[PDB]
Design an enzyme around this catalytic site. Structure first.
Site, PDB file in Angstrom:
ATOM      1  N   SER A  22       0.545  -0.794   0.166  1.00  0.00           N
ATOM      2  CA  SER A  22      -0.176   0.090  -0.054  1.00  0.00           C
ATOM      3  C   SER A  22       0.827   1.353  -0.207  1.00  0.00           C
ATOM      4  O   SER A  22       0.049   2.105  -0.646  1.00  0.00           O
ATOM      5  CB  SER A  22      -0.606  -0.079   0.900  1.00  0.00           C
ATOM      6  OG  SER A  22      -1.308  -1.170   1.534  1.00  0.00           O
ATOM      7  N   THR A  92      17.957  -1.819   2.670  1.00  0.00           N
ATOM      8  CA  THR A  92      18.162  -2.861   3.723  1.00  0.00           C
ATOM      9  C   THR A  92      18.556  -3.834   2.600  1.00  0.00           C
ATOM     10  O   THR A  92      19.305  -4.025   2.367  1.00  0.00           O
ATOM     11  CB  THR A  92      16.978  -3.432   4.137  1.00  0.00           C
ATOM     12  OG1 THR A  92      15.407  -4.088   3.266  1.00  0.00           O
ATOM     13  CG2 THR A  92      16.072  -2.477   4.717  1.00  0.00           C
ATOM     14  N   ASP A 159      11.673  -5.315   8.216  1.00  0.00           N
ATOM     15  CA  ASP A 159      10.392  -4.492   8.431  1.00  0.00           C
ATOM     16  C   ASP A 159      10.445  -4.220   9.429  1.00  0.00           C
ATOM     17  O   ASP A 159       9.294  -3.966   9.930  1.00  0.00           O
ATOM     18  CB  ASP A 159       9.214  -5.362   7.903  1.00  0.00           C
ATOM     19  CG  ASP A 159       9.393  -5.953   6.150  1.00  0.00           C
ATOM     20  OD1 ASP A 159      10.190  -4.745   6.029  1.00  0.00           O
ATOM     21  OD2 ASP A 159       8.338  -6.443   5.742  1.00  0.00           O
ATOM     22  N   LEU A 160      11.214  -4.150  10.428  1.00  0.00           N
ATOM     23  CA  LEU A 160      10.770  -3.646  11.719  1.00  0.00           C
ATOM     24  C   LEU A 160      10.746  -2.025  12.010  1.00  0.00           C
ATOM     25  O   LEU A 160      10.046  -1.690  12.684  1.00  0.00           O
ATOM     26  CB  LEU A 160      12.157  -3.562  12.675  1.00  0.00           C
ATOM     27  CG  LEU A 160      13.285  -5.208  12.821  1.00  0.00           C
ATOM     28  CD1 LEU A 160      12.751  -5.744  12.316  1.00  0.00           C
ATOM     29  CD2 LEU A 160      14.353  -4.875  13.879  1.00  0.00           C
TER      30      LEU A 160
END
Length: 271
Positions: A22, A92, A159-160
């Protein structure tokens, strides 16, 4: 071939799209200092609230210092534009071998030795986060953000920082697969135990090869079941009693009755 770079020349963006959500589009990139390909994630800044944009910047700074074998490396972040889009870029460690979600889709079941090893690694990653000072709570652990280093590698939680976009208390559209979360997370009133809940639901999915609560058509029906103690129907499909017991103690309604991470790592199941 390069369609962007960080201000210091350290990271380059390729026009090779490798994920979407999204709020984001993810591209392949390169660390020119090391020669290793990285992920270059562009977050759509205009969709975020002021407080989210502030949060993301603070969390990205603490993220850059983290190192653990079962956490995806977070290299850096900055604001960028291209044509009419302002974004926040996050760079990342590139994960090329999918996720637990993709693994289950492809291989259909997870054999118990694999379940045992990968769940143990997820718990080490969470124990690492929760023992930072102050604790880092993931808040949005799921099969689709636990990445594998190879089909027989190790797992790394990812995805922290993106978890700060979980928008747990928001009204949301009834489209796609309805989601659950920990009962307290509906009110944004979390601690470490929300990650235990999420771990339990991940383990359930690993043990059953289905997303919990598929019997429900929307997130309101799920909310009514989770906040009244009603388990997902797939709970009753867990074949191994030991695995079922662990799940059960993780996904308790009342946060104070859940397993601790220490007690899971000490459980017979996990050596």
């Amino acid at each position: 071939k390069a369609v962007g770079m960080s201000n210091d020349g350290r990271f380059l963006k390729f026009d090779i799209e490798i994920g979407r959500g999204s709020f984001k589009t993810v591209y392949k990139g390169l660390d020119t200092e090391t020669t290793v390909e990285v992920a270059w994630c562009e977050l759509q800044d205009r969709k975020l609230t002021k407080s989210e944009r502030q949060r993301f910047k603070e969390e990205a700074e603490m993220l850059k210092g983290l190192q653990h074998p079962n956490i995806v490396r977070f290299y850096d972040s900055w604001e960028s534009t291209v044509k009419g889009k302002k974004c926040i870029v996050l760079v990342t460690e590139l994960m090329t071998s999918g996720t637990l979600k993709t693994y289950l889709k492809r291989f259909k079941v997870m054999k118990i030795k694999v379940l045992r090893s990968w769940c143990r690694q997820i718990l080490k990653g969470l124990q690492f986060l929760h023992t930072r000072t102050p604790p880092i709570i993931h808040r949005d652990l799921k099969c689709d953000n636990i990445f594998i280093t190879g089909p027989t590698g190790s797992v790394k939680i990812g995805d922290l920082g993106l978890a700060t976009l979980k928008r747990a208390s928001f009204a949301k559209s009834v489209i796609g697969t309805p989601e659950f979360m920990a009962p307290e997370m509906y009110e944004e009133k979390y601690d470490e135990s929300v990650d235990v809940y999420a771990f339990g639901m991940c383990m359930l999915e690993m043990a059953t090869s289905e997303y919990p609560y598929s019997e429900c058509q929307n997130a309101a029906q799920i909310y009514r079941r989770v906040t009244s103690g009603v388990k997902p129907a797939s709970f009753d499909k867990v074949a191994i009693p030991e695995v079922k017991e662990i799940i059960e103690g993780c996904i308790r309604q009342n946060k104070d009755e859940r397993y601790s991470i220490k007690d899971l790592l000490n459980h017979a199941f996990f050596q």
